Symmetry: D2
């Protein structure tokens, strides 16, 4: 019996590297030897039961790798191909799915959450979830297609176009990918707010035209106020922090007629105040943006053509054995993305 | 000197019928003999200084009438024509105006607020604000084009289409016109929530497929709950009450992927709680809708073709002399729209 | 061995009723006892090889019926349920599919074309293609969900909204369903052009505000000319005839800023002249509309709620044995839809 | 009496530099000392009566300059300010205008066509047509805001977004500005077809990822064919040549589900063949794009922030006296934009 290492969430709180069998693919699956899988802040939440899951299960939902076996029903992608995986499996038979709102599937299953994921030497990827990318690419770059696709869906919703002004709240990997996607979609002012200096400097290397530090003073006045960066507000605010303060500032940063996109996840049940008078009189749009419906191919192509800076986003590369400790502890100071390389 | 009665807001709190000169039109104005002007809940707010204004000023911004004099620069509408007036004058030179967001003009002036309005025998209407409608029409029907246009802008924003399910919160004139516009835009379920029986019955006569009474139990469960009218939520919620409770219920009535449109005006500075987790995970849209940008002609045409029921919306017809008392007191029990006929 | 009648296209030109085995469902299929299947003009084309197919094959792609067996993997629709079938099976793995353009799937297979269809006592319907509708419904009404869904996609593309003016060219079943969907989507003028009197009268019974006869004079002048029904053109033209003349008139019927939607199928390779100067200077939109992407559930719900008149659309009800003759001959004089009842 | 040179179109065929009075502004006008006015191919058409005009009239509709006098009603832009002018004056009172389709105004008047334009030392610009830009800017850059705004409207219509693939047909100033706007709007492949080598090289300096020469072989195969640049077609084709061949190739370059935008002006009455079968079965959009509705401020801001390369677009700078000859003759070999500097 041929074995492999896998980082397994045994149950809420219990995570370790274990030896498991190499899975064998059904007729519509690909078996993929993982080149990289990214660690997400969702993975920490999954560990502490803050998001649901079906333990025991191999974590990891941000991965790419080389197809080493195809199932008998798969005929258009062969062994040797490189793919990135869309972890979100929609059912195709519920009313959300039949309306094209596949991200809102009521039977949604995610690879790395309800099915064994990418923190392992090998991972099973159903064919429909597999997106082919060039062999000439840097081997780890494909691991970014998933978080990039989430950001691209948000940027699509926002209406950013040539000449837009944009504020992004939060300088994690989502904020920083969003800075880049904002510039690519034509924004000529892209302001990023984040408390860490290192992350502000990185924002500027990957496209931010300015940055602000919310420790240093009132961000709303710094950005939107009479002597701020963009007096009267920006066209688009993208909230990428998932904390009450940034959600709360978002509408006051928007100009009249502007849009707020909520990418950040605030804990369930937690409440934040809005002012409906202002939403009406300034005709705002407040839009939730959830995962990656029909954008994975575009995301894969952006990475394939080198339109996105990926290398500066990688803070660290670790082994499978090191993963449980990194996932069990909070992120390090200037940390953007940690890649698990099996 | 030829005179006329006008209902004048002398200053905050002070309203009475006065004799004023018949205005003489500039070269781009029409002088219109008023056939009807509607009283709005905004008119009560204006009286008590809750919305700003430039007193002393003739109130009334929902009117139609017969052109009796044209200014020298006006050449395409002659004396004898019937028109309805768009009260909202945009400047055309500020950045909102140049972006096509004329409802967000930073120099906005409204007839009946910053300029003498329609509670008078005659009213001056700049040509660009005048929309011609048929002489064969019921003389008072034109007075509804303004509130109808506000509702039409909201319905446009909402995305209601053939087969949509819709909940409307508040059974004033805006709610009830919105019920009708929802059906016309293709909604096959249109549910109206309002506390007054009389207004629920009227809702059903003008297109509501069901009504609910928020006194009688939990509206959210009655509409969206497992054994409610539309289990799982409606496609579109239009909030037309302008109170904290309906704003607050709106998102919980929407299905995943749904839209909330805020038409109702909540007092400035007043705060209401949302749950950002739900907005994100259920990918909601929350949209403010403000007045009547580029929809006045369509609104006038809907009234001209008889697609909207207007007669059941008129609760009472009063004289100029009776107006100060009706405006100074709260609305009567089953009151929908009061028309001032000079 | 239990048998059934099926109308089989043996090969190009060869069509007859044959006895075939009752199919047995795979684990994701439903076996459906057909209550009705509609005959389409596409079925005549399929017979004469003008559209491709994989003979021998049972024709019929417009059907509804009662589930009599479920495959082992199907758990949410049981025997006894009534369903309508979406005949268009998309692959989910090609680039069109992954972009959400499932109607443009490059591996598209249609029930009744590449797979055995509904002109039989029983039909296999993969679960994802099955849409549940009420048992209380008229048994034959479900057979209209497919052509209705095609029309609904066209009407969605057109931008028809409250107060739109609309011309529809061609009074077959597509034109007539489109008249109804135009009114439901809020059009207040809906003009239908067709040469047959009987079909003009029917158009008026199901929502057309006027009709025109292209034999009787210049349709462009009758509709759009200075003394026509809508001087200067309509907002939306929907071409539903599939002949060179209606395609050619479409742009001249549209007002400046208007939209043309092409629903009609003109023979491959056939050419029609446009005037690019006019398309530019009058800023027209010309849009192709192809089948039924993500609209089948909405179509099924419109039929379920009785928002569409179906009974007046049924010209005749025939047996399986009568089908080969009706399909082999051209349509009769006032013929709208012929239903095959097994 | 203080005088100035002006390039005047005396009547069809007759163009020369003349001495005219310096105009005096009405109360809503600005008097602008011209820093630059661009020559357009429309100016040649105007000379030979191919487009209408109201001679005698000063030509020039692509200009910027310094405000030297304000009319008494103008209070927000003072002498000393730099502005670029929107030449297209809409009436605000026709049905197109009231629907927000200001580019389709039926009473449209253009500065440089129906009113004295920018080929003069001074030009009158009504305040609403004046867009302020920075004094720190290169003095001639403002002259590009008008053609840039036309291209921006086209790019908005096209739906180009992050990751789009694009073909542009014609390498004049419109094509080349469109290459730049395509890249800025997020296109990762931007292919430009033009016969002149010099213009292909320039396309590559300002953002084209590839270029093709339609003299060298079949452009449709070179771009969209099985071994072309983008097998199966691009997302967006923008036709910028205004000749029958490029209009005709446009649809065959588009992928299934793609968009064609027609910016190019083909002579009135001239006809080109389309294939309606292909438009339907490949669900294409063919969109006319006409001038600059509500995009002038965004265009001015793109030039103000330096997001567009302007200097490489200027082929030559000439005096007023040289203008009649340049306008009377066809454009020179590698000519992109000629600027008249008074
Ligand atoms: N919608 C979706 O489909 C989707 C997909 C993936 C992730 N997410 C969510 O998106 C959010 C960001 O994810 P991530 O992976 O980038 O997480 P992250 O590493 O937590 O990034 C968020 C960052 O926001 C910054 N921040 C905190 N408070 C702030 C404030 N008041 N103002 C400005 N910045 C502040 C922090 O950096 P400093 O320490 O420098 O301030 C923090 O690192 C999370 O809520 C995550 O759950 C959503
Ligand atoms: N966005 C715009 O451009 C625009 C334009 C015009 C007006 N407005 C605003 O729209 C709102 C409605 O105007 P209107 O003229 O129709 O005013 P209205 O006569 O005040 O109508 C609102 C109605 O809502 C009902 N209501 C109150 N609490 C409720 C609850 N908890 N649940 C359900 N219904 C409730 C009341 O009827 P019952 O007594 O039967 O409950 C009340 O009559 C106002 O806020 C107004 O300022 C906005
Ligand atoms: N896009 C899609 O997904 C889709 C789906 C289904 C069908 N289709 C296509 O849509 C078209 C209509 O289908 P159908 O089933 O309704 O077919 P149909 O029964 O052929 O209807 C077309 C009708 O157009 C009328 N007509 C012919 N020439 C005309 C003219 N010059 N002016 C006005 N009317 C004219 C005819 O009626 P009179 O004899 O009264 O003139 C004819 O009956 C066909 O081309 C079909 O292939 C497309
Ligand atoms: N929609 C609007 O609002 C708007 C605004 C301004 C201008 N326009 C129009 O847009 C068009 C372009 O204007 P422009 O000022 O850029 O004019 P231009 O200088 O005439 O540019 C068109 C260029 O197309 C190229 N061309 C000709 N035939 C070609 C072919 N078969 N394939 C590829 N390229 C070809 C030519 O360059 P080579 O010699 O290198 O081929 C020619 O220089 C004109 O029709 C103009 O009227 C429209
Ligand atoms: Zn689903
Ligand atoms: Zn303004
Ligand atoms: Zn496919
Ligand atoms: Zn106009």
């Amino acid at each position: 019996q041929s074995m492999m290492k896998a980082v397994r969430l045994e149950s809420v709180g219990n995570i370790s590297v274990r030896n498991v069998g190499i899975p064998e693919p059904g007729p519509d699956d690909l078996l993929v030897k993982v080149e990289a899988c990214g660690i997400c802040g969702t993975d920490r939440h999954l560990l502490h039961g803050e998001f649901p899951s079906t333990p025991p299960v191999t974590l990891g939902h941000e991965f790419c790798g080389i197809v080493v076996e195809a199932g008998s029903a798969v005929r258009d992608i062969a062994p040797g191909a490189r793919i990135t995986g869309d972890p979100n499996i929609s059912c195709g038979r519920c009313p959300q799915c039949q309306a094209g709102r596949v991200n809102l599937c009521r039977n949604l299953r995610a690879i790395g959450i309800h099915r064994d994921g990418g923190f392992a030497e090998y991972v099973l990827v159903p064919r429909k979830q597999a997106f082919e990318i060039p062999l000439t690419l840097d081997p780890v770059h494909g691991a970014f297609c998933e978080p990039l696709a989430c950001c691209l869906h948000g940027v699509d919703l926002s209406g950013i176009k040539a000449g837009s002004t944009v504020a992004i709240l939060g300088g994690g990997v989502i904020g920083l990918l969003t800075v880049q996607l904002a510039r690519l979609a034509g924004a000529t002012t892209v302001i990023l707010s984040t408390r860490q200096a290192t992350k502000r400097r990185l924002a500027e290397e990957v496209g931010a035209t300015a940055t602000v530090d919310p420790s240093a003073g009132d961000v709303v006045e710094a950005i939107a106020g009479p002597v701020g960066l963009v007096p009267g507000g920006v066209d688009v605010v993208i909230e990428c922090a998932g904390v009450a303060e940034t959600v709360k500032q978002s509408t006051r940063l928007a100009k009249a007629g502007g849009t707020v996109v909520i990418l950040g996840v605030l804990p369930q049940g937690e409440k934040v105040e809005i002012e409906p008078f202002d939403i009406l009189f300034r005709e705002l749009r407040v839009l939730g943006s959830f995962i990656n419906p029909f954008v994975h191919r575009r995301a894969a192509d952006l990475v394939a053509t080198g339109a996105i800076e990926i290398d500066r986003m990688i803070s660290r590369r670790i082994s499978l054995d090191e993963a449980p400790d990194v996932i069990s502890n909070p992120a390090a100071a200037g940390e953007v993305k940690v890649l698990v390389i099996p």
